[PDB]
Structures are given as structure tokens and as C-alpha cells.
Design an enzyme around this catalytic site. Structure first.
Site, short mmCIF file in Angstrom:
data_model
loop_
_atom_site.label_atom_id
_atom_site.label_comp_id
_atom_site.label_asym_id
_atom_site.label_seq_id
_atom_site.Cartn_x
_atom_site.Cartn_y
_atom_site.Cartn_z
N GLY A 1 31.17 -23.41 46.18
CA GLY A 1 30.09 -22.59 45.31
C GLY A 1 29.34 -23.37 44.30
O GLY A 1 28.16 -22.69 43.79
N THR B 1 35.35 -21.77 47.45
CA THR B 1 35.69 -21.89 46.05
C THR B 1 34.69 -22.02 45.18
O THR B 1 33.76 -22.90 45.20
CB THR B 1 37.11 -22.61 46.13
N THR B 2 34.69 -21.14 44.25
CA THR B 2 33.69 -21.34 42.96
C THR B 2 34.69 -21.63 41.75
O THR B 2 35.37 -20.51 41.24
CB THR B 2 32.92 -20.15 42.83
#
Lengths: 227, 228
Positions: B131, B1-2
Site C-alpha cells: 500500500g 499491507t500498509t
């Protein structure tokens, strides 16, 4: 006439007599007045002394409930003090949970709700006080009154207690849009000196407080030199 | 996940990727990680999908009630405080990193970070997820205060593309939303139009020379492409 023994019973006409009786205790108490200027709010009240030997500050009727808000009690003082505690708890809850100073209109509605619940149940009686609430948070200056029925309203100026009929007459000759908080203290104190009855209550003093720009929206007692 | 949020002059931009995974397999390639808490306040969610969905829903329920009781729109600081309290009271049983961001007329555009552990920090930008580690240096070199709303959307799209080209746990669409005094503006960029990827960068077109043909010299030239 059994219908007037508890607050959980209507009368045939649709009234709740125990609540009316509690209101009669407020109407026989000492007088209070308040006014909402463009800067702030000012409150003043008459204290009937029971002895010439009391310290100063004894049986104070005005109490801070947050940095920016305060309450004045009319009628029975120990009943008023139970409402002051509740109000303190609601103001703290608003800071801790919602990260805001409690808005004036919200504080008044919670105080009303709390007072109303004691007019519903066979095992409790109604409070014998009316509360004046004075606040200056992000909704501006605000002045409210809550009575023993739990009814809540907003005012520009108000009087309570046994001098109220005359005091109201004199608050109607003020200009609310224009007046400042230093003028207000002089006018409000004058009304209270004039309605005092010298036969019945021999010893008395005045207590006065405000929240305004001058004070940095901090609710406080006025310094004793301004009377 | 970012995930991320950035302040600009008069508001905020939130951005995210769209991938949800069990480690090495992609269960959803089009998740939506920007969750609405009130008309002009959103959060970004990272960690356990179950935990973040449950705490976002509870925070939203409490803000709707508060707004009805006061008859006014809520401030970003109130949403951050409610969310912080739920993250902190449940810290041993959840996996959650949150960003709360939004617009209100008292303080303008605001960004708050609530990482694992339940602390609450008020910033100019925030990064979160697996991320994020790839982006600290990108912001240190290329971020400035006072960007316009269009600058800031473009910057956040680029930042998300850089992180997801290097992080195996991020990928897919880029979703953005911009919050200011006007209406909220959402946008979705598909992978085919991403502003950066390694696959189309010309410095990674030519293959490394790992498989040189059998020769009479020690000079290294090209990879073998056909049988001898």
C-alpha cells in the site's frame, strides 16, 4: 603443601594460593596512580629502565582501547598486553553489534570476567598484572581496577605496586570534586617522584595519559612538555 | 499491507492495517503488525508473516539481555542495528520490509527504515508494504514537520484509510501507537468509523453509464433499470 600447585584447588581454609602468589608479582612491580576529576581521568606510571640505551616509548605501560578509553598495566607487562587485546575486541564488539561506545562499567566487568576464568582450570595460570581502566563514554568519567582474582572495583583515586601504601596517604589529601586535569598532572607526578627508591632502581621515567573535555573525550598521552 | 511511522516533536507514531491474505482470500482480518521490541521501541512488519515474526522475536531477546547487562533503557539506534544485521545476513532466504521506531532520551523520537536487501536509513517518516505506493504523493502534498502528537495520530489514520481503499491486499482495522516520554498510547479504529472510504465518498455515488437502453438517439442519459 600440595594444595598450592594449581589454581583449581581450594586449601583447607578456603583460599586459592596460586592467585595469592600472582598478586605478589603485582605488589613487587613499579608504582601507578590515578585520579578521577570533574572533567575526566588522569593516569600516571613509573617505568623502571633496564638500560640507558632504550628508545623513547619502549615498554609503554599505557594503551588506548577505544577512542574514549584506555588501560594502564601494573605487574608483568606481557600478561597485561594479552588483556589489552581482549579489551580492544570487547570495545569493537560494542560498536559493531550494539552501535554504542562501550560504557566504562561494562568494559570493566568484561575484563574481570576474562581474568577470573584463568583462576578456575588446572591447565592455565592466573595473570600477573592488575589493570587500571579509564573511560569517558555516555556514563561520565569512570576509573576502575581489575586484579588477578578477577575482582573489579570503582575508585576516585588509586595506587598500585610497591609504593602504594605511601602513595595512598598522599591521594587522601586531594579534593576530588574540585580538581582539574592540569592540576592533577602536577600532583600525581609529584607523588611518583617522591616514592621512587633511588638505591634499588637507578634509571626511570614517567608516563602520563588522560581523557577529558579539553581533549574532546579522546584518550591520549600527555604532550611531553607538561612534566 | 500498509505500514508507516512518522516523527513528531518529542516522539513517533506507528500505524498499520490489519489484514493478512493468501492473495485473494483473507485468512485473518484482525492481525496486529505493530510488534513490541522494548518498552518504548516498536517495529512494523511487512512481507512473510513467518519471517518477520521470527526476526522480531530474536531482536527482542537480544535487547532484553543488553538492558539487564547495562542496567539502562536501550536506544533506538541499537535496536535498528541488531535488526539490520539479521535482515542482511539472511537476505536470500526471507521476504521482509521492516520499520523500527521509538523514543529514547538521548536522541528523542527516531525512525529507521530497513527495506528488502538489508539497508538501513534514518528518516523523518517511512512507508512500507504493498500500500505504500499509494501514499508517496499524499505525503509529498500534505505532510509537514513539527506536527503535535494529536495532529500526527489523525494524519496517519487518514493516510492508512486512503491506502487501504485502493489496495486490495490491505483492509480492516487501523491500529496506531504513539511513543514519547510518557506512557505508550495504542488505538484501534474499526472499518465502520474509518475517516475515508470510496463507498461513502459522494463523487462515487452515481453509477457510470455503461448500460443505456435501446433508443432512437445517440444521446447518452441513464442506465436501464427495468425490462422493456
Amino acid at each position: 603443601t600440595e594444595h598450592d600447585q594449581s589454581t583449581d584447588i581450594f586449601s583447607a581454609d578456603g583460599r586459592v594460593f596460586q592467585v595469592e602468589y600472582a598478586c605478589k608479582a603485582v605488589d613487587n612491580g613499579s608504582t601507578a596512580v590515578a585520579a578521577c576529576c570533574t572533567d575526566g581521568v588522569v593516569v600516571a606510571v613509573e617505568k623502571i629502565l633496564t638500560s640507558r640505551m632504550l628508545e623513547e616509548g619502549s615498554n609503554d605501560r599505557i594503551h588506548a582501547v577505544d577512542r574514549q578509553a584506555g588501560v594502564c598495566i601494573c605487574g608483568m607487562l606481557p600478561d597485561g598486553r594479552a588483556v589489552v587485546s581482549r579489551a580492544r575486541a570487547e570495545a569493537e564488539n560494542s560498536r559493531d553489534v550494539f552501535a554504542t561506545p562501550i560504557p566504562g562499567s561494562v568494559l570493566a566487568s568484561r575484563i574481570g570476567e576474562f581474568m577470573h576464568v584463568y583462576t578456575t582450570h588446572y591447565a592455565y595460570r592466573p595473570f600477573g598484572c592488575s589493570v587500571i581502566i579509564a573511560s569517558y563514554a555516555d556514563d561520565g568519567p569512570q576509573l576502575f581496577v581489575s586484579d588477578p582474582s578477577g575482582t573489579v572495583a570503582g575508585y576516585y583515586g588509586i595506587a598500585l605496586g610497591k609504593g602504594k601504601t605511601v602513595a595512598k596517604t598522599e591521594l587522601e589529601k586531594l579534593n576530588f570534586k574540585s580538581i582539574t586535569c592540569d592540576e592533577a598532572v602536577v600532583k600525581l607526578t609529584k607523588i611518583l617522584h617522591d616514592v621512587h627508591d633511588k638505591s634499588k632502581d637507578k634509571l626511570y621515567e614517567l608516563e602520563v595519559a588522560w581523557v577529558c573535555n579539553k581533549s574532546n573525550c579522546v584518550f591520549q598521552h600527555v604532550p611531553n612538555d607538561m612534566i | 499491507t500498509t505500514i508507516m511511522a512518522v516523527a513528531f516533536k518529542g516522539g513517533v507514531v506507528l500505524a498499520a492495517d490489519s489484514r493478512t491474505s493468501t492473495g485473494t482470500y483473507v485468512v485473518n482480518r484482525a492481525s496486529n503488525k505493530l510488534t513490541k521490541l522494548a518498552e518504548k521501541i516498536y517495529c512494523c512488519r511487512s512481507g512473510s508473516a513467518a519471517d518477520t515474526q521470527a526476526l522480531a522475536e530474536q531482536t527482542a531477546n537480544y535487547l532484553e539481555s543488553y538492558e539487564i547487562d547495562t542496567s539502562k533503557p536501550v536506544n533506538v539506534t541499537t535496536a535498528a542495528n541488531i535488526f539490520k544485521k539479521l535482515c542482511y545476513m539472511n537476505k536470500w532466504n526471507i521476504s521482509a520490509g521492516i520499520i523500527v521506531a521509538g523514543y529514547d532520551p538521548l536522541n528523542g523520537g527516531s525512525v529507521y527504515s530497513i527495506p528488502s536487501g538489508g539497508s538501513c536509513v534514518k528518516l523523518d517518516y517511512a512507508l512500507g508494504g504493498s500500500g505504500s505506493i499509494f501514499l508517496y504523493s499524499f505525503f509529498d502534498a500534505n505532510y509537514k514537520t513539527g506536527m503535535s502528537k494529536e495532529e500526527c495520530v489523525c494524519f496517519c489514520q487518514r493516510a492508512v484509510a486512503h491506502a487501504y481503499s485502493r489496495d486490495g491486499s490491505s483492509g480492516g482495522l487501523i491500529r496506531t501507537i504513539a511513543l514519547h516520554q510518557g506512557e505508550p498510547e495504542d488505538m484501534t479504529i474499526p472499518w465502520t468509523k474509518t475517516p475515508y472510504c470510496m463507498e461513502k465518498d459522494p463523487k462515487y455515488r452515481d453509477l457510470a453509464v455503461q448500460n443505456p437502453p435501446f433508443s432512437s438517439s445517440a444521446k447518452i442519459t441513464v442506465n436501464q433499470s427495468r425490462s422493456e
